[PDB]
Scaffold this active site. Structure first.
Site, PDB file in Angstrom:
ATOM      1  N   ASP A   1       6.255  -7.322   5.933  1.00  0.00           N
ATOM      2  CA  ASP A   1       4.900  -8.320   5.686  1.00  0.00           C
ATOM      3  C   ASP A   1       4.503  -8.004   4.206  1.00  0.00           C
ATOM      4  O   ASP A   1       5.481  -7.517   3.490  1.00  0.00           O
ATOM      5  CB  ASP A   1       3.928  -7.773   6.711  1.00  0.00           C
ATOM      6  CG  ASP A   1       3.172  -6.273   5.808  1.00  0.00           C
ATOM      7  OD1 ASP A   1       3.622  -5.674   5.216  1.00  0.00           O
ATOM      8  OD2 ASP A   1       2.217  -5.802   6.770  1.00  0.00           O
TER       9      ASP A   1
ATOM     10  N   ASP B   1       1.340  -7.321   1.440  1.00  0.00           N
ATOM     11  CA  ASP B   1      -0.137  -6.609   1.425  1.00  0.00           C
ATOM     12  C   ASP B   1      -0.823  -6.933   0.163  1.00  0.00           C
ATOM     13  O   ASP B   1      -0.066  -6.727  -0.867  1.00  0.00           O
ATOM     14  CB  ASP B   1       0.204  -5.234   1.714  1.00  0.00           C
ATOM     15  CG  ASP B   1       0.875  -4.659   2.993  1.00  0.00           C
ATOM     16  OD1 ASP B   1       0.546  -4.822   4.173  1.00  0.00           O
ATOM     17  OD2 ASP B   1       2.134  -4.394   2.904  1.00  0.00           O
TER      18      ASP B   1
ATOM     19  N   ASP C   1      -1.273  -9.013   5.350  1.00  0.00           N
ATOM     20  CA  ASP C   1      -2.502  -8.167   5.268  1.00  0.00           C
ATOM     21  C   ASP C   1      -3.356  -8.582   4.115  1.00  0.00           C
ATOM     22  O   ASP C   1      -2.812  -8.225   3.072  1.00  0.00           O
ATOM     23  CB  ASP C   1      -2.310  -6.930   5.446  1.00  0.00           C
ATOM     24  CG  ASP C   1      -1.675  -6.647   6.839  1.00  0.00           C
ATOM     25  OD1 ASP C   1      -1.837  -7.256   7.703  1.00  0.00           O
ATOM     26  OD2 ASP C   1      -0.771  -5.505   7.003  1.00  0.00           O
TER      27      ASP C   1
HETATM   28 CA   LIG Z   1       0.917  -4.493   6.209  1.00  0.00          CA
HETATM   29 MG   LIG Z   2       3.821  -3.906   4.109  1.00  0.00          MG
END
Ligand SMILES: [Ca+2]
Ligand SMILES: [Mg+2]
Ligand code: NA
Length: 327
Positions: A194, A196, A251
Site C-alpha cells: 500500500d 501511506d 492510507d
Molecule cells: Ca498502510
Molecule cells: Mg504501507
DNA sequence: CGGCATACG
DNA sequence: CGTAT
DNA sequence: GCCG
C-alpha cells in the site's frame, strides 16, 4: 554488542541473513494465527536481530549472547544451517491451517479472529467466501472484489503518480497543506502492499476538518474505489496503468503540525520498530509514546518536538534515519 | 512469574 | 470487530 | 518464546 530493543540498533532494508529471518518470521506469523502474541513477538524480535547483524550467521556459536535467541529460535537456525531447511517451518508452510489463515487475513477487512471463525466453519478458499456473500461486511466485499489487484506489489514508480493526485486534492481542500510519503517507501522499500501519506498544515489548527474535504474531492475525481469527522482513511484507489488501471490500497492520515514529528515517526515504522520504541520509552524511560506525542506521567507534561531527531533525543537514543528502521 | 505498543474507524 | 505503523 |  547487540542491544535488546530493535530501536537501539540500525536495521537496514537488505541484510546478510535473509533466509534465516524469513524462516523465523513464518513461525511468528503462525503464532499470530493461533493468538499467541507473545511467541509472535519473540520470533519477530529474533528475526530482527539477524537483520541487524553485519555478516551472515554460519555457525551456531554465533548466536551465543544474542538477545531473543533461546532453545527454540536457536534450534530453527541450527537446522537451517545444517540441512538448509527447518522441519517445523516446512510443516507450517504446508499446513492447511497456515495457508488458509494467510489467505483469509490478507483480505482487506478480515483479521485473525474473522479468518479463524471462517476456518472453523469449514471455509478454505476465496470462492468459498464469494458463494456466501451475506456473511460479508461491505469492507470485506470490497477487499474480496479487489483482492487480486491488492496482491500485486505497488511499485515506487506508482507512488509518485499517486502523490501528485493526492496533493492536487489536498491543495484544493486547504491551500498550504502538505503531503508526506511515509510507511515502507519512506524506509527505502522499492515495493509495497500500500501507500501511506501523512497530511498537515504549517498553521496549527488549520488541519481540523481536512480529511473529509480531501476524500470528497478524490471521490469526485472518480479515484476512490472504496472508502469508509475523522483523521485516518483506509482507501482503495484507482491507479492508472497502460491502457487500463489497477486498484491500490492508500492510507491517508492528518495530524496537526505540533504532532507531525510523532505521526511521521509512527507511520514510518516499521511496525516492529514502533512497538519496540514504545516499549523502550515506557519500560526504560517511564515515558508514554504514541503517534500524537510523548507524555511524562510524573510531571503530567507532553514533550514538544519539532523533528524526529528531537524525539530520539528525548528518549536518549541515537538517531536512526528511516532507512535504518527496517526492524 | 508478568509482560509483551498504541492508537483510530 | 476492522484498520494503521 | 524469551527477558528481566
Ligand atoms: Ca498502510
Ligand atoms: Mg504501507
Ligand atoms: Na486483513
Amino acid at each position: 554488542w547487540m542491544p535488546a530493543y530493535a530501536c537501539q540498533r540500525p536495521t537496514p532494508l537488505t541484510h546478510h541473513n535473509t533466509g534465516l529471518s524469513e524462516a523465523l518470521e513464518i513461525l511468528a506469523e503462525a503464532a499470530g494465527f493461533e493468538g499467541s502474541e507473545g511467541r509472535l513477538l519473540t520470533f519477530c524480535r529474533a528475526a530482527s536481530v539477524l537483520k541487524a547483524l553485519p555478516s551472515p550467521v554460519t555457525t551456531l556459536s554465533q548466536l551465543q549472547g544474542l538477545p531473543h535467541f533461546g532453545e527454540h529460535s536457536s534450534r530453527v537456525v541450527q537446522e537451517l544451517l545444517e540441512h538448509g531447511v527447518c522441519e517445523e517451518v516446512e510443516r507450517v508452510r504446508r499446513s492447511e491451517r497456515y495457508q488458509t489463515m494467510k489467505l483469509f487475513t490478507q483480505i482487506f477487512g478480515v483479521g485473525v479472529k474473522t479468518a479463524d471463525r471462517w476456518y472453523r466453519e469449514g471455509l478454505r478458499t476465496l470462492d468459498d467466501l464469494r458463494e456466501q456473500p451475506q456473511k460479508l461486511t461491505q469492507q470485506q466485499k470490497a477487499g474480496l472484489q479487489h483482492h487480486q489487484d491488492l496482491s500485486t506489489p505497488v511499485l515506487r514508480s506508482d507512488v509518485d503518480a499517486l502523490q501528485q493526485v493526492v496533493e492536487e486534492a489536498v491543495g484544493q481542500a486547504l491551500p498550504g497543506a502538505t503531503v508526506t510519503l511515509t510507511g515502507g517507501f519512506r524506509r527505502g522499500k522499492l515495493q509495497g502492499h500500500d501507500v501511506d501519506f501523512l497530511i498537515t498544515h504549517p498553521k496549527e489548527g488549520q488541519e481540523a476538518g481536512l480529511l473529509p474535504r480531501v476524500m470528497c474531492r478524490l471521490q469526485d475525481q472518480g479515484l476512490i474505489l472504496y472508502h469508509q469527522a475523522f483523521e485516518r482513511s483506509f482507501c482503495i484507489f484507482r491507479l492508472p496503468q497502460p491502457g487500463s488501471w489497477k486498484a491500490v490500497r492508500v492510507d491517508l492520515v492528518v495530524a496537526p503540525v505540533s504532532q507531525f514529528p510523532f505521526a511521521l515517526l509512527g507511520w514510518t515504522g516499521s511496525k516492529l520498530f514502533q512497538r519496540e520504541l514504545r516499549r523502550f520509552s515506557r519500560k526504560e524511560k517511564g515515558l508514554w509514546l504514541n503517534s500524537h506525542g510523548l507524555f511524562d506521567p510524573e510531571q503530567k507534561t507532553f514533550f514538544q518536538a519539532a523533528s524526529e531527531e528531537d524525539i530520539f533525543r528525548h528518549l536518549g537514543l541515537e538517531y536512526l534515519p528511516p532507512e535504518q528502521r527496517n526492524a
